[PDB]
DNA sequence: GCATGCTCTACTGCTTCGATATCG
DNA sequence: AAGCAGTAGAGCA
DNA sequence: TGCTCTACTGCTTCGATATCG
DNA sequence: AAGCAGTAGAGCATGC
């Protein structure tokens, strides 16, 4: 109540302290929710009204640190205090529109605070939007894929996870009510076939073909159950051709092998009748990864062993 | 006290005349009528507006004699202005065009005024006609209506289209007619309204007629409405005993808007849900919150705080010993110049009233101050509260009034002098003569004041004094917008606002080429 | 510099006959010097309350200095003017103060030489700030203080030269040992009487300098120039009334909140809206809505025509008048365009007309720019700086309407009498000195609490008429001007 | 090969304080 | 917040 | 109904309070 | 506005 009353006063606090007050009010919401069954209700309004008046105002052009503070307060509070499109379908759409306005591709700036915070909040908390995550997807993937080429040493790595959880939480729903979606399924499938065959000039559409292939190998098995069997054969050929024919001496692409192994493993858990000629190449693969442990980074060294 | 304005609006067929593609007169008259009624409903004046709507298909009157008082329809009588009249002016997209005459609306307005007035009197009676002068006339009653308006005191003001005898916007303080608009119906209506207006009041019958160009952008509608002032009695002294009983009144001053923004709470639409508090909380530590009865009003001195709050300062303050309009001294040398005036008002000190020997003495005083540049230093106080002040009493020798005007003056704490560098004998920043002639071409192409009309008295383009105030206009139209359509977002600004505040066109076109000259010759700007 | 401060050291010569009455029962120069020092402090403690003011007596019997010399006693150190410093210092007034200074430090010794100027230099060197003025006020009466030893004279003029080198200047305010200025001696070697500036003339002033706005004037759309909009007549007034706790004698540090929504609780900026009532119907809006309905243009000046200096009547004014000057944060040459525009606007007596929006969101306002050419003289009577000047202009409901329909003519038997009267009352105006009664007596009344001498001090006000000296100066024509043509006659 | 360590200056904000609009 | 001079409501005759 | 104490009342002056460059 | 202070972040030299 002390730090909550200290923003219910008249003018003070030159915003690099109001940043920290908004951060403490959310981190306190994360740890130990025994007392705020009641008071954490109004803290939602205290975040949203301020983020509204900082977002939409034709005069008094917006403030930069207080956006970062209010967003990181919400991305600490939204654990254990969800309001999703199942039980309260208003504030969910409100926060969704607010983060969508917060992640638009500004170009003539440096100021990577609102991109980073909005991307991280969507990344960790992607699962709360269960009807408004499935209808803007070409624009969504285009702006996210724009920011996966953002050329920032801490924001490319912070945006890739957002892309990941976006794909993960759209997959579970397109598999859910099958055969009467029947167009979104076809759209992602016909954008995924051959996009691993892309003779690419980067490393990223490569990896996202890998990841979406290994993830959407699931929902083809309720409908087709033969493209899933063409899958992993196409996949293990298109991954064995990447390194076990050429230049294991000279290459620097050791950084996509966890994506490799997770993709092959997640289709291999759904497969049947593994063709018995490729498993002597799967077993050169995973021992190459067991060898390729000390040229890794911490943080990556844990999902690798996963 | 109470004011009364009656608005005649033509709805006749040629008033339902078409548009060439620049602007339309029926829309213009709608804008002017809604400007007047928004001022009246948003200033809370105790008055009445009435409508006389002539040119509709229908006929509504107690008496409608054949063809006269035909196409006479009433919608709202003399009433205080409200949003019903704005509904009547916004739900009038239909003309329903037919006209019998336009000389019947005046007599039926005078008749309904006189047969409706009982118990609720007025101190002015003003009727404004809005017609484009093409419908038929009838001079059946001329001298009896002239004597009825002369014995009932019904003053009237007349409004005409933009045709008096490049791209004309609304009016940009330039030529009113594009090329031509005079016909014989225009001629006959213009001369009959001219002769009734001279035979009512005289020379202003040729000058109290206004176009829709210069009625939006000027306050000529706002004449014979406002109440004068509060009569100020005081007494001027010279020396021992020159005790002139005197009247003072105010003059030009800063205008402020009277309404205030009441803070309410949302989702309830009542006021009483706010009870603000403040605590005089000496914490300086973990928090201690005290009651009132503890507070000494401490001042700052040198490097510390010194006590002793108020009844002692209320005793040992300055005793002000009464108001005064006294005279300190004089000066034949007019050495109070313009850049020292320094007040926020100006005070017309007029004369005496009521056995005006004192006033003829004051007119003798200013008729002695007239002949040479002799100034008068006068000390003023409103009351016991106001600090006393020095000021200058300028004389004012004019046509129907001989007055004195009081301005303030600085005390010697309110100056400061500070050395700035000289620009004549400056060896670095001296210009060139082609640069000087570029400036002179810019001036003589952007000049606004030149003498003409064969007697070489000065005529000025763009006189920046006659503009109505745009701030309360913009604010009041935005409020009527929001309380009319109760969810729409706010507009951008109107275009007749910038058609009011524009400089004229030919001066811009004349300056187009020397502005290119100054851009092309003067050196780079960052 | 803007945040620069000035400095003053009072060096008192209380040695041989200055502590004596000069065998004169008329005035004593020690009490005169301490009165002048008290006047300086007691003016600059509200005039210019941030400079540095020190008090140092020399020739004393004891010593107090950080190089540890003899006969030299510093008393206070370089700091603000303080009530403690003056309540400490006024214990040396009169003969009671003469005896108290005798017992407290003593008087009379073979005084110093160069070493006291060494003490002044080591007093100025310690201060870590930006000293802008370095002056020494010397209160002495002898004028050959080492007229028996020339080595001390040569060393004193050498050390004074090395104090002049680093930028220290002294102005010895001469006491009156011969009364009149008859000591036309040879003290030209050290220097770079009249005491009235130190005595009276500055009981209520201040010192400050800012710029108030830095805006840009655009002529067409592309020709921009940068002007600083200075303010030169500002209406000073009394300082804000600090709040204070009764017992612990400290500020109160108030705080403010809003609640009781027919539930109690506590509120935020967002829960509440702005509103208005107009007769019967109520409007509601947001704070951004009521702040955005007055939004026209961008900050700066917009050129909207030209006019010569003949239409504007000085019946017409609204506010004080500012002063625009060609600053230096657009280009090296905006000064030159302003100089050319200055020359042409002055010689063809034309004045600019502009629209002016002061800061980020204010409605626009019409101003008129009138030029001004500087005036200086032989002795640098810099009375005007060269530059342009704003005059404001009214719009619509500024000008009200009088009753105004009154016009009566008088008789011309009074004009010569009134010409003689106004030639009797004629004084050449002023340059300064018409000071403020309310602020002035507030200054004196605040002196009489932390200095608490007796009562409210002197409170003359130079804005009253003197009817007693007006009656005899005018003469007995008041009755004939009262009843030459017109009797009131009840 | 990019994984690290190291260095100088323009963008952001801080703080005092003088003015200004505005409320009571 | 704190007076202030016309404008009347009703005691007094 | 004729006179006056008095009970307002719009109407102005000032004094203190956030707002902002 | 007047001044100070920090520092983020892109640009100099050598490393499993």
From Swiss-Prot, chain A:
The chain holds residues 154 to 459 of 4128 of the full protein. This is DNA-dependent protein kinase catalytic subunit. Autophosphorylated at two clusters, the T2609 cluster and the S2056 cluster. Autophosphorylation induces a conformational change that leads to remodeling of the DNA-PK complex, requisite for efficient end processing and DNA repair. S-nitrosylated by GAPDH. Serine/threonine-protein kinase that acts as a molecular sensor for DNA damage. Involved in DNA non-homologous end joining (NHEJ) required for double-strand break (DSB) repair and V(D)J recombination. Must be bound to DNA to express its catalytic properties. Promotes processing of hairpin DNA structures in V(D)J recombination by activation of the hairpin endonuclease artemis (DCLRE1C). Recruited by XRCC5 and XRCC6 to DNA ends and is required to (1) protect and align broken ends of DNA, thereby preventing their degradation, (2) and sequester the DSB for repair by NHEJ. DNA-PK is a heterotrimer of PRKDC and the Ku dimer (composed of XRCC6/Ku70 and XRCC5/Ku86). Formation of this complex may be promoted by interaction with ILF3. Component of the core long-range non-homologous end joining (NHEJ) complex (also named DNA-PK complex) composed of PRKDC, LIG4, XRCC4, XRCC6/Ku70, XRCC5/Ku86 and NHEJ1/XLF. Additional component of the NHEJ complex includes PAXX. Following autophosphorylation, PRKDC dissociates from DNA. Interacts with DNA-PKcs-interacting protein (KIP) with the region upstream the kinase domain. The gene is PRKDC. It is found in: Nucleus; Nucleus, Nucleolus; Cytoplasm, Cytosol. Belongs to the PI3/PI4-kinase family. It comes from Homo sapiens (Human). The lineage of its organism: Eukaryota, Metazoa, Chordata, Craniata, Vertebrata. HEAT repeats lie at residues 135-170.
Curated annotation (Swiss-Prot), chain B:
The modification Phosphothreonine is found at residue 520. Residues 238-437 form the Ku domain. Induction: In osteoblasts, by FGF2. Its main location: nucleus. GO terms for cellular component: chromosome, telomeric region; cytosol; DNA-dependent protein kinase complex; DNA-dependent protein kinase-DNA ligase 4 complex; extracellular region; Ku70:Ku80 complex; membrane; nonhomologous end joining complex. It is an enzyme of class 3 (hydrolase). Its EC number is 3.6.4.-. The EEXXXDDL motif is required for the interaction with catalytic subunit PRKDC and its recruitment to sites of DNA damage. The VWFA domain interacts with the KBM (Ku-binding motif) found in a number of DNA repair proteins. Belongs to the ku80 family. This is X-ray repair cross-complementing protein 5. The chain holds residues 6 to 541 of 732 of the full protein.
From Swiss-Prot, chain C:
Changing residue 130 to A: Abolishes adduct formation. Its EC number is 3.6.4.-, 4.2.99.-. Individuals with systemic lupus erythematosus (SLE) and related disorders produce extremely large amounts of autoantibodies to XRCC5 and XRCC6. Existence of a major autoantigenic epitope or epitopes on the C-terminal 190 amino acids of XRCC6 containing the leucine repeat. The majority of autoantibodies to XRCC6 in most sera from patients with SLE seem to be reactive with this region. There is a cross-link at residues 243, 273 (Glycyl lysine isopeptide (Lys-Gly) (interchain with G-Cter in SUMO2)). Belongs to the ku70 family. The active site is at 1 (schiff-base intermediate with dna). The modification Phosphothreonine is found at residue 411. The chain holds residues 31 to 534 of 609 of the full protein. Induction: In osteoblasts, by FGF2. GO terms for cellular component: chromosome, telomeric region; cytosol; DNA-dependent protein kinase complex; DNA-dependent protein kinase-DNA ligase 4 complex; extracellular region; ficolin-1-rich granule lumen; Ku70:Ku80 complex; membrane. Residues 217-424 form the Ku domain. The modification Phosphoserine is found at residues 21, 262, 433, 476. GO terms for biological process: activation of innate immune response; cellular hyperosmotic salinity response; cellular response to gamma radiation; cellular response to X-ray; double-strand break repair via classical nonhomologous end joining; double-strand break repair via nonhomologous end joining; innate immune response; negative regulation of DNA-templated transcription. GO terms for molecular function: 5'-deoxyribose-5-phosphate lyase activity; ATP binding; ATP hydrolysis activity; ATP-dependent activity, acting on DNA; cyclin binding; damaged DNA binding; DNA binding; DNA helicase activity. This is X-ray repair cross-complementing protein 6. It is found in: Nucleus; Chromosome; Cytoplasm. Residues 233-297 are annotated as: DNA-binding. The keyword Cell membrane does not apply. Changing residue 134 to A: Abolishes adduct formation. Residues 329-438 are annotated as: Interaction with XRCC5. Coiled coil: none annotated.
